[PDB]
């Protein structure tokens, strides 16, 4: 830059650019223009009673909203000039915690003084961490309820117990209304962790829900979700997805009066027929003498526990040995491995992505260029403005086709969050998620096992295909989910746009969802080919230099003749290929690069393309509170 003053002026300009950018982000939240500041509370340990501190937390002005079981409230004060909306969740109740922390702007964790947190709390903590934390603030309760001699050491013992999850964070105690005021102040002025999924879409938390049935006998009618728009500008033409109940097209939006403004009937838009985004999840349009033979003719309760131990041994057989499958001697090997082929090299040798495809692929949607459409959609949300309802506006939504069970469970306690789907998000595709196994569970999980997915705001059961996470075209199928590897789960699911957090759960017993694998959503495409391998073992029992006789790999003669072009390989590293079949039983002469050890094992690799099972249902049962066995 040069020149003392001119060099400094450069720095002065950049300060004014960055300070304006910061002021833009904070005025959007908690105030006269912005919505409220939605704060979720989780007490982590069982000893902690949330009403004990939540009654300190309430006092400004209160507006106690109520449900069946849960009691969440609005807080408003012109002293700090900040609008709040508190929400309280019990850990273990996985269903509620995750579904309303994915809208909550701030999480406030409550912690017991003598221990760190409960095992039940740790379960919910592992989920929140992996589905995406907003802004966390740690709080305690039993600190001032102890003498000064212990009070110093208690906070030190907590810090060591906390470090293993929250590395460096201050703990603010909740005992006095003065202490709680310090906390509110801290929650207001805080660096916001902008969660990527929430920002590109447009969402609502439900403050009040009304049901107008068209026909009560049909048990389907019009919903009236009233709350604040928080994400982007809500467009009526776009579809709307309610979190636990699926996606449905909505009829009408209206903007009534804001029930709680900071300092104290008309419809916004009606949906046209043509501009409307359409509800279509799948594709619409579908001479010899008497006795002589052939040879001479040429001249002329405890059942599941037993199955678990079977799975444990199958996992050991596929961790010690790659994918060693024994050839059947009863059925012909060319028949049992009909659809299998040999690759010269798994990395290089060509395989057509549009070759032999299932009929289930002719029911989904592909992308011509995924990344280009992803850039085009994300630009048309950020750089473009639509005629819809802006953020901060208290609106009411009217949805055309919605079941009674939605309202029924809302009045019980479970919150409704509804987010506007982006373009091409009602359609189905083949979703790919890179996902590592959580150290919590050590249950053997097979490939086409039915699992519970949480692909960011969506919930479903599915049967995935686990794969190698590679950069190449072909991906090798993994028959079991490994404890340390990162793996790609491939499943038919309705197309969502990355980035999105992805969780995997498994229905245990009594209806307990057990977190097995956490990750994220990768690129969504059906062209990503997953390849199942089968390694057939053989035995070299007669060895000459460079050429050897192998048995027990096959049992017929024309089994060897079928897999002639398949290149053999060897445990001790020799690369060969079969020459002649000899016996009527499965014996073969085989050429190699070098001389084989007698201690050796010959083996060929067979490959087929495998596609996932179509087991998509948006309905997933409510889990019971989680506990440790």
């Amino acid at each position: 830059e040069l020149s003392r003053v001119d060099q400094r002026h450069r720095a002065s300009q950049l300060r004014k650019q960055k300070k304006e950018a910061v002021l833009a982000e904070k005025r959007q939240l908690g105030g006269k223009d912005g919505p409220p500041h939605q704060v979720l509370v989780v007490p982590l340990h069982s000893r902690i009673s949330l009403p004990e501190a939540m009654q300190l937390l309430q006092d400004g002005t209160v507006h106690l909203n109520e449900l069946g079981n849960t009691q969440n409230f609005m807080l408003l004060c012109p002293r700090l000039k900040h609008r709040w909306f508190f929400t309280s969740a019990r850990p273990g109740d996985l269903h509620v915690v995750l579904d309303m922390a994915k809208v909550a702007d701030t999480i406030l964790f409550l912690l017991d003084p003598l221990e760190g947190w409960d095992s039940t709390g740790d379960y919910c903590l592992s989920c929140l961490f992996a589905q995406g934390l907003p802004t966390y603030t740690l709080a305690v309760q039993g600190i001032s309820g102890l003498p000064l001699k212990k009070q110093i050491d208690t906070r030190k013992k907590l810090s060591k117990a906390v470090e293993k999850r929250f590395p460096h964070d201050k703990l603010l105690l909740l005992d006095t209304q003065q202490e709680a005021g310090m906390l509110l102040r801290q929650l207001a002025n805080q660096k916001q962790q902008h969660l990527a999924f929430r920002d590109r879409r447009a969402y609502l938390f439900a403050h009040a829900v009304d049901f107008v049935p068209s026909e009560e006998n049909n048990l389907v009618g019009t919903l009236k979700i009233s709350g604040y728009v928080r994400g982007q500008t809500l467009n009526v033409n776009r579809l709307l997805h309610i979190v636990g109940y699926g996606d449905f097209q909505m009829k009408q939006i209206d903007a009534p009066g804001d029930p709680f403004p900071l300092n104290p009937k008309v419809l916004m838009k009606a949906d046209p027929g043509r501009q409307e985004s359409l509800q279509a999840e799948v594709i619409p349009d579908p001479k010899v003498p008497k006795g002589t033979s052939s040879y001479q003719a040429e001249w002329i309760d405890e059942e599941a526990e037993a199955k678990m131990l079977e799975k444990y041994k199958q996992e050991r057989l596929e961790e010690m040995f790659p994918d060693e499958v024994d050839t059947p001697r009863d059925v012909a090997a060319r028949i049992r491995f009909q659809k299998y082929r040999g690759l010269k090299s798994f990395r290089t040798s060509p395989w057509d992505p549009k070759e032999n495809l299932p009929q289930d692929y002719a029911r989904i949607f592909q992308f011509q260029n995924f990344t280009n459409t992803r850039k085009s959609i994300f630009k048309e949300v950020e750089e473009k403005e639509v005629e819809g309802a802006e953020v901060g506006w208290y609106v009411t939504l009217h949805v055309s086709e919605v079941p009674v069970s939605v309202v029924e469970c809302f009045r019980q306690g479970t919150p409704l969050i509804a987010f506007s789907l982006l373009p091409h998000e009602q359609k189905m595709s083949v979703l790919n998620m890179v996902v590592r196994r959580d150290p919590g569970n050590t249950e053997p999980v097979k490939a086409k096992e039915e699992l519970i997915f949480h692909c960011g705001f969506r919930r479903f059961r599915a049967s995935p295909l686990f794969s190698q996470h590679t950069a190449a075209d072909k991906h090798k199928l993994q028959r079991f989910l490994t404890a340390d590897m990162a793996l790609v789960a491939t499943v038919y699911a309705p197309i969502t746009f990355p980035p999105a957090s992805v969780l995997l759960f498994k229905q245990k017993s009594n209806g307990m969802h057990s977190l097995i694998a956490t990750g994220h959503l990768m690129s969504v495409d059906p062209d990503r080919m997953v390849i199942k391998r089968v390694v057939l073992s053989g035995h070299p029992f007669k060895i000459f230099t460079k050429m050897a006789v192998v048995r027990y790999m096959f049992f017929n003669r024309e089994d060897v003749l079928w897999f002639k072009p398949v290149e053999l390989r060897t445990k001790w590293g020799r690369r060969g290929h079969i020459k002649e079949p000899l016996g009527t039983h499965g014996h073969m002469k085989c050429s190699f690069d070098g001389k084989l050890k007698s201690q050796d094992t010959v083996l060929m690799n067979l490959y087929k393309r495998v596609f996932p099972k179509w087991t998509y249902d948006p309905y997933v049962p409510e889990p019971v509170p989680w506990l440790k066995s």
Binding site: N356, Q368, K564, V566
Partner: peptide, 18 residues
Amino acid sequence: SICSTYSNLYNHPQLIKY
């Protein structure tokens, strides 16, 4: 007859164009 096929390219997913 050995490890050779004619496998037709006749059924594919409907692709969204850019």
